[model samples]
Target chain A: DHIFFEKAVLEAPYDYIASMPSKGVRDQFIDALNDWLRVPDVKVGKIKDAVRVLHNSSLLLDDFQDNSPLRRGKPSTHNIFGSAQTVNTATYSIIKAIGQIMEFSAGEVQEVMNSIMILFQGQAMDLFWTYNGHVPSEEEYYRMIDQKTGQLFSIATSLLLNAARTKIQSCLHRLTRLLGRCFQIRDDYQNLVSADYTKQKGFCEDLDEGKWSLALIHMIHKQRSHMALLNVLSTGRKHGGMTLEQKQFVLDIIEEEKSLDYTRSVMMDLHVQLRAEIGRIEILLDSPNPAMRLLLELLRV
Target chain B: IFFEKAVLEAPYDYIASMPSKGVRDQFIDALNDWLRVPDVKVGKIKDAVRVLHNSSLLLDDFQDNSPLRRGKPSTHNIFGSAQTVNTATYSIIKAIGQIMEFSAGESVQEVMNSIMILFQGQAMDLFWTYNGHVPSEEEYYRMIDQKTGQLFSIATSLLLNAADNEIPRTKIQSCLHRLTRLLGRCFQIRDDYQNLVSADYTKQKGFCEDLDEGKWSLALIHMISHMALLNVLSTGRKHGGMTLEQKQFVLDIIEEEKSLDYTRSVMMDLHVQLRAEIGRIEILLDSPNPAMRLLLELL
Candidate 1:
């Protein structure tokens, strides 16, 4: 009881980020999937809280690592609390989430642990390619997203499946991987073009971060001889900041190469596969799942 | 797997390569004299400590913005903070998984819970520094107990859980806890004292690096009522670093106020208490731990 103040301070950064509004798509996705798996409300609620904690905690670290200033249209947690406190809070929150999950089903805790590691590995690759200016192949890009972006989605699925009696486990696995790709690629595309993204994050903030998004990866591959985009990215990586003009210049090249168009096409393709998988799962579960379809549509370009 | 491991472990392996004083390993070994955990289990616990300690150092360098670690370029300096931060965080989870492999019963959970305390302790340390608040001496000791003592406590937890002795561990629990807290304060204040004075520390870290970090160590906390040192600290926080002149000025103030001397006395007092704690444990267990006694002397 005396340590409550310290506990509150420890979690203040996490609380700050969680207070901000976002799409809550992951929560929606988990809820939509529960329609078929039929996990109890209590278990589903716990799993959702764990996932939300992990997600927000990872965002604090991500913003700090990325030197991001805006998170949900406000100063990032690191900016408010300083990087050291922000990192400790994020990491402590991660461990806290694992501990909570450990109480619910100790046997399944290993998978949560495994997924967190996988998420970090994915992030490692993303940072390596961006900081080193190494462009990943399309195949490598997909693999990276699956590791980094797909991990939380898979974690949610694994938690749900732990209690569910559903036999459609294979479909859920495939569906999560597809959803991971779609979620990441779509976010990458939006980062470049989405106005709301501009308000919430900043203009082409991914470019500012020098991250190897799908759009940039596609452009770099198609225009391997140009070296324009790579040049800007490497300069940004070296200086740790890109001018707005530089970001716009890269966006111009992206448009010239129609990278976002390619990104859009990729998103559409994944959406097709996602919808097909959802349809198949629906038939198997003997239910018409329009909620899943609506969520897919919301993600579509 | 190979490439990912290589990329991810680069930061971890970098810090791991640099030689620590092996104080923690020594700590584990000395404690093993009392716990009598199997040699193999002790080794695994040692491995866990090694990884977790190096990982924490990697993060601490990033968090503290240190350019050097163990007398060389810090991992963040080489790998960049983004990758270094990712690796550090990941390595922690990696260590946890490693612990899970050999740990049965409640040891894994114990380690995780200790890590939370460790982070909370760190959060307070950073919070005070960044916010430019001076904590009382009592509060400062509590922070060290959480941040530094928890590591010592973590190793003991593993040892106690894995121990096969018939010594009725619950009886010694309070003694071990007191020893942990005393040693934690001892180790941290010793570190803080050294950061301001030790030549080896100067070479490994830097001169008055804690001042550069704007850390309110024991010496600073002793002089807290004085605004002269606090002003210099505020300047360091404002400018993101302390200049040589500013650091020297802070040192001058510490010397004039006899704060460093005060810190040394505090450390000596802790050393005395730790020896007493070891004696208490030895008498309780009817086991003489020369290694534990020698380790305290070494500290």
Candidate 2:
């Protein structure tokens, strides 16, 4: 978010920020912000600028992680540039971005940085947990999700609260994180339901990969009767196609067991809770920023 | 006495310029300083130091993919891959023997455990890259834990061992582990940044070399997810065939995102947190030992 201010102050024209390294990456970030924001704050623009830098740097690292041949349907960064240089560029860009943030807002910068640390820690735990065969308890899973998914939500809210500096704003920050975790869980469920079978995709990439997601845990603990169904789905298909009846049977079990419905209900509960929390921030609701209104609407939805 | 001593004696200009040499020298200096503690058996400590150095060199060579090592061709590169792997393993085992000999009757089993953890971390790094699944953020954290954090843990663990079971030393070990993990992550992220943004005057390696090798560093992983979410990164045959300029454009976006800045600030915070942890440890201890004093100085 501070990156824009740094660029704006130094570059001759405001548009130059877009042409700077990772500008397209920056725009993608702006789009994510747009999705997240129902009503935009002036700070949203700043965050988008900052995120432009943040998102690109993270992707550079991710390509190396995936050993990806292509990124955005093109030759990956490591593919075009050697691994050493690609890593160096990603490192440099991240530092420069931080420099921009520090210059822009010294006080709030550290909080945002803490959020990143939490995110990384959660990521590390997730990796460790995956290789370990056993599923974690629900509480452990929640802790993992909070650190990985909830941390970003916390960052988003913390950035806004820091800019605004109000107690009411801080409560909303807490609520947003809970909402973020719910959204993440929902996304995980959707992946299990929607993944293409023809592509040789795992039944639930999360479970197949040994990730202890809510669905797997819920299925294990709550739907014991559907154990056979769960087993069939979890065993997935090897090579050749799933019979039409088999596909229907799995879908039928998911519906009959109400696992999907249970997930949706959980999401709804979180949505309700977040709305109730936002209601306490009356001043924010009354604020002049249309972006803020848009933000409220998005969260409410 | 060794058959390879002649090559070890050879003059090599690259050694004069290598960054790792500087790191190695600094580590050796630190090891030497460590030898001065009272009641420290000089012979045992020297043996341990030698083991550490051998292990460090072996690990460094393995990581850097260097064809030449110590003024001659790399042991692995020259000896064939299988022998090279075996030799490195042998060096590590030898290092362990020396550490055991240095410890004498004292139980430094914890120190040995920490060393095992460090190796585990390195193994995980190798395994993850070979497996080729873009690790979620959680996976990245684990990778750092094993590869970088474990080494830091081992260093602190040994320092604690040298300090003789002081409670404060244990605290210091914990604090140092956290600090080291943050530092390691920062070091890695910085390495990634340097690869991409190096000026022509500074550039020694190919740009985005990590991406070519399919090593998912922090920046590319984050950007790809954001790109997919934003619909800028389409799924298509042509999409998979992007040119250098296009990939650069993506990197540019990551730079715009300033995630690296986000990582650096975290590192600084961890550094501060470590200082606070160490201060707490000082409060807990009745009196600090020479090793503790040395460690504080290092911090």
Candidate 3:
């Protein structure tokens, strides 16, 4: 049922998600979560609205920053409307969304404001990193990812926790952060391997834009061998319209350096840490509230 | 006041006169004695001054399309068009915010709104020029009033309001509104006179540069109206296509009609009226504030 709702949500104009037919998705998610947890009727609508607003705002900001020409295979906001209007409208929308959330959930206004500031800071950091040519260390990478991606996940979990007045929210937040990191890393890895990725989105886009993704960082660590492989790939020589040799060389280097293995190990370490935190909060798993039980089931490895 | 007078005396040394290197020392002097103004954050005021100076230069470069500024390629020319526009707009917004934070007045919001309108007016002017409408004299006057005079009026009014809280806001606002319009009109007419007058300088100068771009200034408006009265109006020729003989004919007629003398008289009358108004305001105040004194002295 939620799958149908998600499909409908995605069908709306990706260029203007705020005007999307997203009510169905919001209702479906709210219904499912309430059915599983019995969240207070008073708070369910507010929480759902807040999440929807946050998601749309984040997407709009991303489109502006990337100077994206298209979104969901159509002209982007800035492409369709001039940049002046697009930037102003996006800014106005974010402010209006914050105002709505504040009015709907006055009690959580401080937390919401903090989350917005964190999001802006994260975006600024990511932009500076791309243009400044500062190669990020592993710890710096994690910090950036956590700020940009994990903050949203944390906000969602924290909001739920606050609504329920439950201590398990901290564990849920940590777990969701690890999950977010894993998802981002996997997406980065898929960029290099998937040929159709360009057709879908986010293929060599990062490379062309000079973005420092995890794959690039890994290659940079083993500079000499990676440099040789890159040279062969970038060479003007081609073989039968297939980059077979070049692709094989990159794969060989990846295998030799064991970068994929190292990436996986880092991801697993975070995953295990998250699992340990979740276990600490497992004592509340069997409370009378069916919502807690449902959340537990959803978190099951 | 001191800085501007120095600038007027040594226009060629304008860049050296900028107080960037001595801002800290100057700010301290003002804070301790000259300004002695309350509720003004020194750092914010300093930044505000910098933003205003930078934006004035930015707009000049933008309008003139001058490649060089301050002995280097302009920010717009060097950084590319988009960044130039961004920097100018960013500077304006930053200056507005700084003024709001540091300046004391109830009219701060009005000043900000006026600046935004000025930017919109400039945008419209650029749009119309690109589309080649060659705006009517009335339309041109309104555009220039918004683009140039509004900022000047706002600055003067803000300072007056800050210095003397007793001066009725509406009265000061009206005075500024009239003074700025007259100033803009005078400047525009003088510019036209300088461009069209075929003196020795005209023979040596670039020919019909403004006309080539289809720019309709005060001189062009006068020529067109005179030609229309003679039933000789025609759109067959491009503005730039006008020959030297045709330009000379137009200039001769303008001289015969004494249009330049008439414009100069109008400017002088406006200056006299504005000076009278300033005197009246100063007399009514019982004691003129430093800002009022400075304005009078500058005028």
Best by DockQ: 2
Candidate 3: interface RMSD equals 24.0
Q: Summarize candidate 2's per-residue lDDT along A179-233 as a digit string, tens digits.
A: 5576567656655675442122334433334455675566667736765754554
lDDT scores of the candidates, listed in order? 0.84, 0.52, 0.54
lDDT of 3 by residue, B1-299 (tens): 89864433232233224432432224233222322333455445555655665665566555645444434455566556565555566666767877876565556877777777777767766676555454676887787787766655555544444543444556555655665566555554554555565432243334433332334556555444232212111211222234343344345556777766765675577667756755665555443444433332321
Q: Chain A TM-score for each candidate, in the given order?
A: 0.96, 0.63, 0.70
Q: Which is better, 2 or 3, measured by lDDT?
A: 3
Is 1 or 3 the stronger prediction by TM-score? 1
Compute each candidate's TM-score over C-alphas: 0.52, 0.39, 0.40
Better candidate number, 2 or 3, judged by DockQ? 2
Tens-place lDDT digits, model 2, residues B127-210: 655554456767777777766655545544454456543244444554555545655555555556555655420244344444
Off by over 4 Å in 3: A1-15, A18-37, A194-197, A223-225, A228-258, A272-283, A287-301, B1-299
lDDT at position B96, candidate 2 = 74
lDDT of 2 at B164: 41
How far out, in Å, is residue A111 in model 2?
A: 63
Q: Which docking category, incorrect, acceptable, medium or high, applies to candidate 3?
A: incorrect
